[PDB]
Ligand binder design. Structure first.
Ligand SMILES: *[C@H]1O[C@H](CO)[C@@H](O)[C@H](O)[C@H]1NC(C)=O
Lengths: 359, 7
């Protein structure tokens, strides 16, 4: 189940699924937690490695066996995802990092009085994922008190530099501290355009909204329903953003459903798991394991315990059943979502609850 | 456009 233990002076080797820059090991672990395939991570603080462009390196990893070889390396930090850790799963990261410049796409500069006022500007700008603030002591005078609001692919810095008198941090939007509004609207028969940042398959628009909420680049979405006119585009969840952070257009379109990320929401933030069981539906994906169980609910329990299981299909086809048990197909994909969603089947599909952090 | 902090 839940493994919070960290491993000092350790670097996991191989199994790499994604890498990025993060300011510390706790942030790297959080990105591991929310990456659909990450089980293990290794982090390199600036002190731990000579190579410049490997400092602050955060390496997300997977293993069919849940274990990997590791080497001793002084100062490196390794650990697990917080999958299956309930309330410890959080997107909230409050830390101000002093003497650090988290680099990205600068879309906003102003002069501010303190780092916490810079943090506030970032938190209340919908496009800001992280910021950098140069203090009154900063060596170059023109930049003193500059507050830079930034974003980047995946919401992690494209570089992190050790730099005196610069203070960086992330938006507190995922800490429910934004004054940006929470928009629960679901628009029937309505599509957005702008810029597509990801594409997955979802059984309904509500799953699509939840994925958008926790995807670092998604501000709004358009879901194409199972009765959408183009067969190959059925159940397509289009995650989107725009230059301003707001949709620049909207198009009435039958069998399309659109809405917003809910990450600004407080009382009504959806948790990062999808609990609904979907009768009559097959979820395509890589087979992880086939077990015989009594009823869809135990099949979901079985997926949830199998930490690498992302979603499941419990079949009632006669060829998949025997004396008082039917087969539970445990599955996974590259992105956490089904590779195909097929209707009119004798099977009930659902998701792992490994990331539920409520209830 | 908006340059980074120097050095
Ligand atoms: C940068 O540009 C925006 C445009 O709305 C302007 O309001 C402000 O000076 C900066 N961003 C924020 C945080 O409002």
């Amino acid at each position: 189940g839940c493994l919070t233990q960290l491993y000092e002076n350790a670097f996991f080797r191989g199994g790499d699924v994604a890498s990025m820059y993060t300011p510390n090991a706790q942030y790297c672990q959080m990105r591991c937690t929310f990456h659909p395939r990450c089980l293990l991570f290794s982090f390199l603080p600036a002190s731990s490695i000579n190579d410049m462009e490997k400092r602050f390196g955060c390496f997300l990893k997977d293993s069919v066996t849940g274990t990997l070889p590791k080497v001793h390396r002084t100062g490196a930090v390794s650990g697990h995802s917080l999958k299956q850790c309930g309330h410890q799963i959080s997107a909230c990261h409050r830390d101000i990092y002093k003497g650090v410049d988290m680099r990205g796409v600068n879309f906003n500069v102003s002069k501010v009085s303190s780092v916490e006022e810079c943090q506030k500007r970032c938190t209340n700008n919908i496009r800001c994922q992280f910021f950098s603030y140069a203090t009154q002591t900063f060596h170059k005078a023109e930049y003193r008190n500059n507050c830079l609001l930034k974003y980047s692919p995946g919401g992690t810095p494209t570089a992190i530099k050790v730099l005196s008198n610069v203070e960086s941090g992330f938006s507190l939007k995922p800490c429910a501290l934004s004054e940006i509004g929470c928009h629960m609207n679901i628009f029937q028969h309505l599509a957005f355009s702008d810029v597509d940042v990801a594409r997955v398959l979802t059984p309904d628009a509500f799953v699509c909204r939840t994925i958008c909420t926790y995807h670092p680049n998604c501000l709004f979405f358009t879901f194409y329903t199972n009765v959408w006119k183009i067969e190959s585009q059925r159940n397509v969840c289009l995650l989107k953003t725009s230059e301003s952070g707001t949709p620049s257009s909207s198009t009435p379109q039958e069998n399309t459903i659109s809405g917003y990320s809910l990450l600004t929401c407080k009382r009504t933030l959806p948790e990062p798991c999808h609990s609904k069981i979907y009768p009559g539906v097959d979820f395509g994906g890589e087979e992880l394991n086939v077990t015989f169980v009594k009823g869809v609910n135990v099949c979901q329990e079985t997926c949830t315990k199998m930490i690498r299981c992302q979603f499941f299909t419990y079949s009632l086809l006669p060829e998949d059943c025997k004396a008082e048990a039917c087969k539970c197909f445990l599955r996974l994909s590259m992105d956490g979502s089904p590779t195909r969603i097929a209707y009119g089947t004798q099977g009930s599909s659902g998701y792992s609850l490994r990331l539920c952090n409520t209830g | 456009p908006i340059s980074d902090f120097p050095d």
